[PDB]
Scaffold this active site. Structure first.
Site, PDB file in Angstrom:
ATOM      1  N   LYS A  43       0.821  -1.217   0.000  1.00 38.58           N
ATOM      2  CA  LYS A  43       0.000   0.000   0.000  1.00 38.58           C
ATOM      3  C   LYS A  43       0.850   1.261   0.000  1.00 38.58           C
TER       4      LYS A  43
ATOM      5  N   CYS B 221     -12.028   4.365  17.503  1.00 36.22           N
ATOM      6  CA  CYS B 221     -10.841   3.580  17.500  1.00 36.22           C
ATOM      7  C   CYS B 221      -9.948   3.473  18.732  1.00 36.22           C
ATOM      8  N   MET B 222      -9.289   4.552  19.113  1.00 39.23           N
ATOM      9  CA  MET B 222      -8.355   4.529  20.222  1.00 39.23           C
ATOM     10  C   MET B 222      -8.866   5.024  21.569  1.00 39.23           C
TER      11      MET B 222
ATOM     12  N   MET C 272      -8.151  -3.326  17.716  1.00 37.19           N
ATOM     13  CA  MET C 272      -9.532  -2.980  17.917  1.00 37.19           C
ATOM     14  C   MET C 272     -10.333  -3.981  18.587  1.00 37.19           C
TER      15      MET C 272
ATOM     16  N   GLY D 145      -4.197   2.659  15.097  1.00 39.89           N
ATOM     17  CA  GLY D 145      -4.592   2.377  13.737  1.00 39.89           C
ATOM     18  C   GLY D 145      -4.318   3.443  12.689  1.00 39.89           C
ATOM     19  N   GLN D 146      -4.617   4.712  13.006  1.00 35.64           N
ATOM     20  CA  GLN D 146      -4.428   5.830  12.076  1.00 35.64           C
ATOM     21  C   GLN D 146      -3.076   6.473  12.107  1.00 35.64           C
TER      22      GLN D 146
HETATM   23  N1  LIG Z   1      -4.677  -2.561   5.136  1.00 40.43           N
HETATM   24  C1  LIG Z   1      -5.150  -1.802   6.149  1.00 40.43           C
HETATM   25  N2  LIG Z   1      -4.485  -1.650   7.257  1.00 40.43           N
HETATM   26  C2  LIG Z   1      -4.999  -0.907   8.269  1.00 40.43           C
HETATM   27  C3  LIG Z   1      -6.281  -0.225   8.149  1.00 40.43           C
HETATM   28  C4  LIG Z   1      -6.976  -0.382   6.962  1.00 40.43           C
HETATM   29  O1  LIG Z   1      -8.036   0.103   6.759  1.00 40.43           O
HETATM   30  N3  LIG Z   1      -6.374  -1.181   6.000  1.00 40.43           N
HETATM   31  N4  LIG Z   1      -6.720   0.509   9.275  1.00 40.43           N
HETATM   32  C5  LIG Z   1      -5.680   1.010  10.198  1.00 40.43           C
HETATM   33  C6  LIG Z   1      -6.583   1.475  11.322  1.00 40.43           C
HETATM   34  S1  LIG Z   1      -7.641   2.883  11.419  1.00 40.43           S
HETATM   35  C7  LIG Z   1      -6.632   0.641  12.488  1.00 40.43           C
HETATM   36  S2  LIG Z   1      -7.740   1.069  13.850  1.00 40.43           S
HETATM   37  C8  LIG Z   1      -5.810  -0.645  12.584  1.00 40.43           C
HETATM   38  C9  LIG Z   1      -6.612  -1.672  13.277  1.00 40.43           C
HETATM   39  O2  LIG Z   1      -6.153  -2.972  12.887  1.00 40.43           O
HETATM   40  P1  LIG Z   1      -6.657  -4.337  13.644  1.00 40.43           P
HETATM   41  O3  LIG Z   1      -7.592  -4.023  14.760  1.00 40.43           O
HETATM   42  O4  LIG Z   1      -5.465  -5.193  13.947  1.00 40.43           O
HETATM   43  O5  LIG Z   1      -7.589  -4.941  12.499  1.00 40.43           O
HETATM   44  P2  LIG Z   1      -8.958  -5.656  12.575  1.00 40.43           P
HETATM   45  O6  LIG Z   1      -9.492  -6.441  11.455  1.00 40.43           O
HETATM   46  O7  LIG Z   1     -10.006  -4.686  12.965  1.00 40.43           O
HETATM   47  O8  LIG Z   1      -8.467  -6.656  13.737  1.00 40.43           O
HETATM   48  C10 LIG Z   1      -9.210  -6.861  14.869  1.00 40.43           C
HETATM   49  C11 LIG Z   1      -9.217  -8.321  15.120  1.00 40.43           C
HETATM   50  O9  LIG Z   1     -10.054  -8.386  16.316  1.00 40.43           O
HETATM   51  C12 LIG Z   1     -10.620  -9.647  16.141  1.00 40.43           C
HETATM   52  N5  LIG Z   1     -11.568  -9.763  17.259  1.00 40.43           N
HETATM   53  C13 LIG Z   1     -12.903  -9.825  16.964  1.00 40.43           C
HETATM   54  N6  LIG Z   1     -13.609  -9.957  18.080  1.00 40.43           N
HETATM   55  C14 LIG Z   1     -12.619  -9.971  19.093  1.00 40.43           C
HETATM   56  C15 LIG Z   1     -12.751 -10.109  20.517  1.00 40.43           C
HETATM   57  O10 LIG Z   1     -13.851 -10.257  21.048  1.00 40.43           O
HETATM   58  N7  LIG Z   1     -11.587 -10.080  21.237  1.00 40.43           N
HETATM   59  C16 LIG Z   1     -10.337  -9.929  20.647  1.00 40.43           C
HETATM   60  N8  LIG Z   1      -9.318  -9.906  21.447  1.00 40.43           N
HETATM   61  N9  LIG Z   1     -10.148  -9.807  19.261  1.00 40.43           N
HETATM   62  C17 LIG Z   1     -11.298  -9.836  18.555  1.00 40.43           C
HETATM   63  C18 LIG Z   1     -10.892  -9.805  14.736  1.00 40.43           C
HETATM   64  O11 LIG Z   1     -11.323 -11.132  14.492  1.00 40.43           O
HETATM   65  C19 LIG Z   1      -9.725  -9.251  14.011  1.00 40.43           C
HETATM   66  O12 LIG Z   1      -8.849 -10.278  13.585  1.00 40.43           O
HETATM   67  O13 LIG Z   1      -5.530  -1.090  11.259  1.00 40.43           O
HETATM   68  C20 LIG Z   1      -4.826  -0.189  10.622  1.00 40.43           C
HETATM   69  N10 LIG Z   1      -4.247  -0.843   9.479  1.00 40.43           N
HETATM   70  N1  LIG Z   2     -17.722  -2.144  10.954  1.00 34.40           N
HETATM   71  C1  LIG Z   2     -16.629  -1.413  11.229  1.00 34.40           C
HETATM   72  N2  LIG Z   2     -16.570  -0.077  11.082  1.00 34.40           N
HETATM   73  C2  LIG Z   2     -15.427   0.604  11.387  1.00 34.40           C
HETATM   74  C3  LIG Z   2     -14.280  -0.073  11.851  1.00 34.40           C
HETATM   75  C4  LIG Z   2     -14.351  -1.450  12.000  1.00 34.40           C
HETATM   76  O1  LIG Z   2     -13.433  -2.069  12.380  1.00 34.40           O
HETATM   77  N3  LIG Z   2     -15.525  -2.072  11.684  1.00 34.40           N
HETATM   78  N4  LIG Z   2     -13.132   0.675  12.131  1.00 34.40           N
HETATM   79  C5  LIG Z   2     -13.379   2.023  12.604  1.00 34.40           C
HETATM   80  C6  LIG Z   2     -12.041   2.655  12.777  1.00 34.40           C
HETATM   81  S1  LIG Z   2     -10.628   2.219  13.780  1.00 34.40           S
HETATM   82  C7  LIG Z   2     -11.797   3.812  12.039  1.00 34.40           C
HETATM   83  S2  LIG Z   2     -10.196   4.535  12.233  1.00 34.40           S
HETATM   84  C8  LIG Z   2     -12.832   4.422  11.117  1.00 34.40           C
HETATM   85  C9  LIG Z   2     -12.141   5.130  10.045  1.00 34.40           C
HETATM   86  O2  LIG Z   2     -13.064   5.351   8.948  1.00 34.40           O
HETATM   87  P1  LIG Z   2     -13.042   6.767   8.067  1.00 34.40           P
HETATM   88  O3  LIG Z   2     -12.029   7.730   8.579  1.00 34.40           O
HETATM   89  O4  LIG Z   2     -14.407   7.202   7.730  1.00 34.40           O
HETATM   90  O5  LIG Z   2     -12.395   6.148   6.709  1.00 34.40           O
HETATM   91  P2  LIG Z   2     -11.421   6.743   5.612  1.00 34.40           P
HETATM   92  O6  LIG Z   2     -11.531   6.034   4.321  1.00 34.40           O
HETATM   93  O7  LIG Z   2     -10.032   6.755   6.127  1.00 34.40           O
HETATM   94  O8  LIG Z   2     -11.934   8.290   5.477  1.00 34.40           O
HETATM   95  C10 LIG Z   2     -10.943   9.301   5.212  1.00 34.40           C
HETATM   96  C11 LIG Z   2     -11.444  10.192   4.089  1.00 34.40           C
HETATM   97  O9  LIG Z   2     -10.334  11.111   3.923  1.00 34.40           O
HETATM   98  C12 LIG Z   2     -10.415  11.410   2.509  1.00 34.40           C
HETATM   99  N5  LIG Z   2      -9.246  12.246   2.392  1.00 34.40           N
HETATM  100  C13 LIG Z   2      -8.044  11.688   2.086  1.00 34.40           C
HETATM  101  N6  LIG Z   2      -7.087  12.637   2.102  1.00 34.40           N
HETATM  102  C14 LIG Z   2      -7.799  13.814   2.444  1.00 34.40           C
HETATM  103  C15 LIG Z   2      -7.368  15.189   2.665  1.00 34.40           C
HETATM  104  O10 LIG Z   2      -6.200  15.570   2.582  1.00 34.40           O
HETATM  105  N7  LIG Z   2      -8.358  16.062   2.996  1.00 34.40           N
HETATM  106  C16 LIG Z   2      -9.673  15.696   3.118  1.00 34.40           C
HETATM  107  N8  LIG Z   2     -10.484  16.631   3.434  1.00 34.40           N
HETATM  108  N9  LIG Z   2     -10.153  14.420   2.935  1.00 34.40           N
HETATM  109  C17 LIG Z   2      -9.204  13.539   2.611  1.00 34.40           C
HETATM  110  C18 LIG Z   2     -10.799  10.214   1.865  1.00 34.40           C
HETATM  111  O11 LIG Z   2     -11.038  10.389   0.515  1.00 34.40           O
HETATM  112  C19 LIG Z   2     -11.837   9.569   2.773  1.00 34.40           C
HETATM  113  O12 LIG Z   2     -13.150   9.854   2.377  1.00 34.40           O
HETATM  114  O13 LIG Z   2     -13.669   3.375  10.589  1.00 34.40           O
HETATM  115  C20 LIG Z   2     -14.255   2.839  11.605  1.00 34.40           C
HETATM  116  N10 LIG Z   2     -15.417   2.032  11.243  1.00 34.40           N
HETATM  117  S1  SF4 Z   3       2.789   3.098   7.483  1.00 37.79           S
HETATM  118 FE1  SF4 Z   3       1.582   1.148   7.350  1.00 37.79          FE
HETATM  119  S2  SF4 Z   3       0.511   1.209   5.295  1.00 37.79           S
HETATM  120 FE2  SF4 Z   3       2.300   2.597   5.274  1.00 37.79          FE
HETATM  121  S3  SF4 Z   3       4.083   1.420   4.374  1.00 37.79           S
HETATM  122 FE3  SF4 Z   3       4.098   1.377   6.704  1.00 37.79          FE
HETATM  123  S4  SF4 Z   3       3.124  -0.601   7.298  1.00 37.79           S
HETATM  124 FE4  SF4 Z   3       2.472  -0.024   5.147  1.00 37.79          FE
HETATM  125 MO   LIG Z   4      -8.707   3.244  13.532  1.00 41.68          MO
END
Ligand SMILES: Nc1nc2c(c(=O)[nH]1)N[C@H]1C(S)=C(S)[C@@H](COP(=O)(O)OP(=O)(O)OC[C@H]3O[C@@H](n4cnc5c(=O)[nH]c(N)nc54)[C@H](O)[C@@H]3O)O[C@H]1N2
Ligand SMILES: Nc1nc2c(c(=O)[nH]1)N[C@H]1C(S)=C(S)[C@@H](COP(=O)(O)OP(=O)(O)OC[C@H]3O[C@@H](n4cnc5c(=O)[nH]c(N)nc54)[C@H](O)[C@@H]3O)O[C@H]1N2
Ligand code: SF4
Ligand SMILES: [Mo]
Length: 720
Positions: free
Chosen positions: A46, A137-138, A305, A342-343
Site C-alpha cells: 500500500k 478507534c483509540m 480494535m 490504527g491511524q
Molecule cells: N490494510 C489496512 N491496514 C490498516 C487499516 C486499513 O483500513 N487497511 N486501518 C488502520 C486502522 S484505522 C486501524 S484502527 C488498525 C486496526 O487494525 P486491527 O484491529 O489489527 O484490524 P482488525 O481487522 O479490525 O483486527 C481486529 C481483530 O479483532 C478480532 N476480534 C474480533 N472480536 C474480538 C474479541 O472479542 N476479542 C479480541 N481480542 N479480538 C477480537 C478480529 O477477528 C480481528 O482479527 O488497522 C490499521 N491498518
Molecule cells: N464495521 C466497522 N466499522 C469501522 C471499523 C471497523 O473495524 N468495523 N473501524 C473504525 C475505525 S478504527 C476507524 S479509524 C474508522 C475510520 O473510517 P473513516 O475515517 O471514515 O475512513 P477513511 O476512508 O479513512 O476516510 C478518510 C477520508 O479522507 C479522505 N481524504 C483523504 N485525504 C484527504 C485530505 O487531505 N483532505 C480531506 N479533506 N479528505 C481527505 C478520503 O477520501 C476519505 O473519504 O472506521 C471505523 N469504522
Molecule cells: S505506514 Fe503502514 S501502510 Fe504505510 S508502508 Fe508502513 S506498514 Fe504499510
Molecule cells: Mo482506527
C-alpha cells in the site's frame, strides 16, 4: 526518474513509516521507504503504491454547493463558499449558542490542522463539540492508559520489538493491519528462535502463522481469559513482588482501594478450568499463555480494535496492563504494554492535541478548571471562554445532529456515512432537513458527500506540509513535494480564513502556514509531560521523526517513559528507578474489572457473533487505495467469512450468496467458508461501498471511552 527526494510519512497505517517521494520536477514519479526512519527503508505494498493515489485525476478540485437538500451539487466560488460557511456558523451561534455547531475530524488530519480546528471551536466559538474518528478507534486505549497509568500513550516504542522474548498479540491482525510491524516481529523470532508468540483472536489470520499458540476464544471472553492468566501467574509464583509491592496499587471490582490478597481473592473467580469453558478453548492454552508471558525474560503485548472496539474496551485494556504490572514486564527494553494505533495521526493530532470533546491540548481536561484557565491564558482568551462541559462524543454528536441540536457541522478527512456504526440511524440523522454540513474531502466517491451541503477542495497528503504522530510517540514531518491540483488549498489556511470570516478574533488564528501553528502548539506543550518544545521545524526537516518527551532542542527524545535517567519528566534525583508520575503516589494501578460480555449477545433468533475486520489491500472506505488497480486483484468486493463446521450444519456451501441479518438490517454477501472464524462467528469487511456493513452493526459504546463495539453484535445467516 526523480531529481529530488522529499521526506515524508506514509499516508496510511499507524506504523507511521517514513517515506521519500521522488519528484521529476513538478510531478511525483517514485517513492521509497525513508532509510532513516524506524521502518529503515521498507514499505508494505500500500505504501509502495502511494504515487498512483497522489497523481489521481479523480479529485475534488473546486468548491461545490448543494443549494437545497436532495439537489445536485454544483460549482461555487471559493469566496462564495467561505462566506456561506462563515455566515451559517456565526448565525447559528448568535441564535442558538456555541453548542449548535461542531467539528468532526480525524486521525488522518495533520496535527496542525486538528490543532487549528480545535482552537477555533473551543477558544473561538466557545463550544467543546470537537470530536473525531479516533473515538471509533483509540478511545478505549486512552481510557486504559489513563486509568492504569494516569497519562495517555505507550511507555515503550517499536524498538522494544527487537528485545522482546515473548509477544502477547491480542485483538490485532498485525500482518494485515501493521505490515511493517508484523515483519519486525517475525524478524525478531527469526533472529532468535526462542522467542514465543501468543496470538489471541477469535479469527485465525496470517498473523497466527508465526505464533507458538493461537487462542481462538469466543468473542468477548478475553477479559475472563486474561484474568485467568493472572490467576495462573499468581498461583505458580511467576509474579514480581519486588515490583508490585513498590510500584502498584490494587483496586477491587467496585473501584475501591485494595491489595494483593484482594487481587488473589478476586482472581479465584477466574480459574482456568472454568474460564476455559467460558472461552471455549483448551485449558492448556490458559496455562501456556500465562507461563510464556511470565517466564520470559521480556514480554511485550500488542493489541488493536479486537480489544478497543468493545463496550468493555477500557477494561480489556486495563487487564492487559495488569499482566505487565503483576510481573514487572514494563519500563525495561523488550518489556512493555503496547497499544497499536490504527491511524497515521490519531496520536499526534487528536489524542495529544486534545481534539476530542472532553479534552484540551497536551493532556488537559475540559472539566478541570485549572486546565481551562491554563488554556485561556496560553491562547489569550477572556476568562471563562472555554465551556466547562465536554461537548458531544461522536455517537452523541450524530445523534444531536439528527435532533437539530447541532445545526452546523464540519466533517474533515473522514467518511462517517460509511464508517459510523448503525448507519440507517446515522443516515437519517445526517439527512436532517435543516442541517448544514460542510465536507472538506479529497475524493468525490466518498459516500458522505451525498449528505454534504458544501464541499471544499483540500490539498491532499504531501501537497502541503504537516506533522503526523504515529503509535510510538514519534512526531514526523512530511514536507510539501508537489503542488495541489485545481483549486485545492491546504486545510490549515481554509480554517484560518473560515475563522476570520466567521467572527473569530484574528489573534486566535494568527497563522500563515502549518509551521506557524507548530510553533504555537510547541509552546502549548512546554512544561507538560508531553513537552515537545525541542521539536523545532528545522530538527523535524533534518530528522526522520523525534519521540517525545523532547523538551529542548539538544534533547534526543524519549523511548522509555516513566524510567529514571531515560524520561526527562522523572527527576534526575528521583529516589526510585521507575516513576508513574501520572498517579499522585507514582504507582500504576491494577484494576479488578469484572468480565462481562458484548452489548448485543447471540440468542435463539440471532445465534451468531458478527465481527468486522480489515484486509491488507484496502484502506478503510477505499476512496484512496481504490484508485490503485493492483490492490483490487485479491479481494475486489465484500464477502462474509463463515466457519467450516457452521457452514456444513447450516447447509451453506462456499461461494453461495447468503443473507447476513441483524436486528438492524439484512445484507446479501458471497460466503467465504474456511477455518478463519472459529465456530459460532462470522466476519464482514467494511471496505466495499456497495455493501455498507455498518448498517448491520449496533451502536453500543463503552460507557467511559464512548468507543463503539464494532467488533461484536448478534447475527443470523441463511442461503439467499
Ligand atoms: N490494510 C489496512 N491496514 C490498516 C487499516 C486499513 O483500513 N487497511 N486501518 C488502520 C486502522 S484505522 C486501524 S484502527 C488498525 C486496526 O487494525 P486491527 O484491529 O489489527 O484490524 P482488525 O481487522 O479490525 O483486527 C481486529 C481483530 O479483532 C478480532 N476480534 C474480533 N472480536 C474480538 C474479541 O472479542 N476479542 C479480541 N481480542 N479480538 C477480537 C478480529 O477477528 C480481528 O482479527 O488497522 C490499521 N491498518
Ligand atoms: N464495521 C466497522 N466499522 C469501522 C471499523 C471497523 O473495524 N468495523 N473501524 C473504525 C475505525 S478504527 C476507524 S479509524 C474508522 C475510520 O473510517 P473513516 O475515517 O471514515 O475512513 P477513511 O476512508 O479513512 O476516510 C478518510 C477520508 O479522507 C479522505 N481524504 C483523504 N485525504 C484527504 C485530505 O487531505 N483532505 C480531506 N479533506 N479528505 C481527505 C478520503 O477520501 C476519505 O473519504 O472506521 C471505523 N469504522
Ligand atoms: S505506514 Fe503502514 S501502510 Fe504505510 S508502508 Fe508502513 S506498514 Fe504499510
Ligand atoms: Mo482506527
Amino acid at each position: 526518474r526523480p531529481e529530488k527526494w522529499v521526506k515524508g510519512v506514509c499516508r496510511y497505517c499507524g506504523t507511521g513509516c517514513g517515506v521519500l517521494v521522488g519528484v521529476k520536477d513538478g510531478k511525483a514519479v517514485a517513492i521509497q521507504g525513508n532509510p532513516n526512519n524506524h521502518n529503515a527503508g521498507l514499505l508494505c505494498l500500500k505504501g509502495s503504491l502511494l504515487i498512483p493515489v497522489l497523481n489521481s485525476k479523480e479529485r475534488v478540485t473546486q468548491p461545490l454547493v448543494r443549494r437545497h437538500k436532495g439537489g445536485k451539487l454544483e460549482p461555487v466560488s471559493w469566496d462564495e463558499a467561505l462566506d456561506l460557511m462563515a455566515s451559517r456558523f456565526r448565525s447559528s451561534i448568535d441564535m442558538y449558542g456555541p453548542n449548535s455547531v461542531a467539528w468532526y475530524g480525524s486521525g488522518q488530519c495533520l496535527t496542525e490542522e486538528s490543532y487549528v480546528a480545535n482552537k477555533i471551536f473551543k477558544g473561538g466559538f466557545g463550544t467543546n463539540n470537537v470530536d473525531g474518528n479516533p473515538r471509533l478507534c483509540m478511545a478505549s486505549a486512552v481510557g486504559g492508559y489513563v486509568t492504569s497509568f494516569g497519562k495517555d500513550e505507550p511507555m515503550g516504542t517499536y524498538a522494544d520489538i527487537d528485545q522482546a522474548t515473548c509477544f502477547f498479540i491480542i485483538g490485532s491482525n498485525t500482518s494485515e493491519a501493521h505490515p511493517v510491524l508484523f515483519r519486525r516481529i517475525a524478524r525478531r523470532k527469526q533472529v532468535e528462535p526462542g522467542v514465543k508468540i501468543i496470538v489471541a483472536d477469535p479469527r485465525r489470520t496470517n498473523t497466527s502463522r508465526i505464533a507458538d499458540m493461537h487462542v481462538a476464544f469466543r468473542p468477548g471472553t478475553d477479559l475472563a481469559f486474561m484474568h485467568s492468566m493472572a490467576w495462573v501467574i499468581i498461583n505458580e509464583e511467576l509474579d514480581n513482588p519486588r515490583f508490585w509491592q513498590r510500584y502498584v496499587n490494587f483496586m477491587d471490582a467496585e473501584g475501591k482501594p485494595s491489595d494483593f490478597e484482594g487481587y488473589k481473592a478476586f482472581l479465584e473467580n477466574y480459574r482456568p478450568e472454568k474460564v476455559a469453558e467460558i472461552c471455549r478453548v483448551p485449558v492448556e492454552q490458559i496455562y501456556g499463555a500465562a507461563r510464556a508471558f511470565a517466564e520470559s525474560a521480556a514480554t511485550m503485548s500488542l493489541w488493536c480494535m479486537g480489544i478497543n472496539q468493545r463496550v468493555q474496551g477500557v477494561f480489556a485494556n486495563n487487564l492487559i496492563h495488569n499482566l505487565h504490572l503483576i510481573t514487572g514486564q514494563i519500563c525495561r527494553p523488550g518489556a512493555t504494554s503496547f497499544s497499536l494505533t490504527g491511524q497515521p495521526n490519531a496520536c499526534g493530532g487528536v489524542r495529544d492535541g486534545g481534539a476530542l470533546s472532553h479534552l484540551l491540548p497536551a493532556g488537559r481536561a475540559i472539566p478541570n478548571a485549572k486546565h481551562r484557565a491554563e488554556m485561556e491564558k496560553l491562547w489569550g482568551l477572556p476568562e471563562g471562554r472555554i465551556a466547562p462541559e465536554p461537548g458531544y462524543h461522536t455517537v452523541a454528536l450524530f445523534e444531536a445532529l439528527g435532533r437539530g441540536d447541532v445545526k452546523c457541522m464540519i466533517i474533515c478527512e473522514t467518511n462517517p456515512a460509511h464508517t459510523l456504526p448503525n448507519l440507517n440511524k446515522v443516515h437519517k440523522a445526517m439527512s436532517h432537513p435543516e442541517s448544514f454540513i460542510v465536507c472538506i474531502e479529497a475524493f468525490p466517491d466518498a459516500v458522505t458527500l451525498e449528505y454534504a451541503d458544501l464541499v471544499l477542495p483540500p490539498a491532499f497528503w504531501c501537497e502541503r506540509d504537516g506533522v503526523y504522530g504515529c503509535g510510538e510517540r514519534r512526531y514526523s514531518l512530511t514536507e510539501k513535494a508537489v503542488d495541489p491540483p485545481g483549486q485545492c488549498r491546504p486545510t490549515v489556511n481554509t480554517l484560518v480564513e473560515f475563522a476570520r470570516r466567521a467572527g473569530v478574533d484574528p489573534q486566535l488564528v494568527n497563522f500563515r502556514n502549518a509551521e506557524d501553528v507548530w510553533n504555537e502548539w510547541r509552546m502549548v506543550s512546554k512544561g507538560t509531560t508531553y513537552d515537545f518544545w525541542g521539536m523545532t521545524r528545522e530538527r523535524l526537516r533534518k530528522e526522520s521523526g523525534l519521540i517525545w518527551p523532547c523538551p529542548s532542542e539538544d534533547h534526543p527524545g524519549t523511548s522509555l517513559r516513566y524510567v529514571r535517567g531515560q524520561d526527562p519528566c522523572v527527576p534526575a534525583d528521583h529516589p526510585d528507578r521507575f516513576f508513574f508520575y501520572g498517579k499522585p503516589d507514582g504507582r500504576a494501578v491494577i484494576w479488578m474489572r469484572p468480565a462481562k460480555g458484548a452489548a448485543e449477545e447471540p440468542d435463539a433468533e440471532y445465534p451468531l457473533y458478527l465481527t468486522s475486520m480489515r484486509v491488507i489491500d484496502h484502506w478503510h472506505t477505499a476512496t484512496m487505495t481504490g484508485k490503485v488497480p493492483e490492490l483490487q486483484k485479491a479481494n475486489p468486493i465484500a464477502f462474509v467469512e463463515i466457519n467450516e463446521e457452521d457452514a456444513a450444519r447450516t447447509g451453506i456451501k462456499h461461494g453461495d450468496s447468503v443473507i447476513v441479518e441483524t436486528r438492524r438490517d439484512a445484507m446479501e454477501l458471497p460466503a467465504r467458508v474456511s477455518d478463519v472464524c472459529r465456530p459460532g462467528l462470522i466476519a464482514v469487511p467494511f471496505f466495499d461501498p456497495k455493501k455498507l456493513v455498518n448498517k448491520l452493526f449496533l451502536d453500543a459504546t463503552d460507557p467511559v471511552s464512548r468507543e463503539p463495539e464494532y467488533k461484536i453484535c448478534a447475527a443470523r445467516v441463511r442461503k439467499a
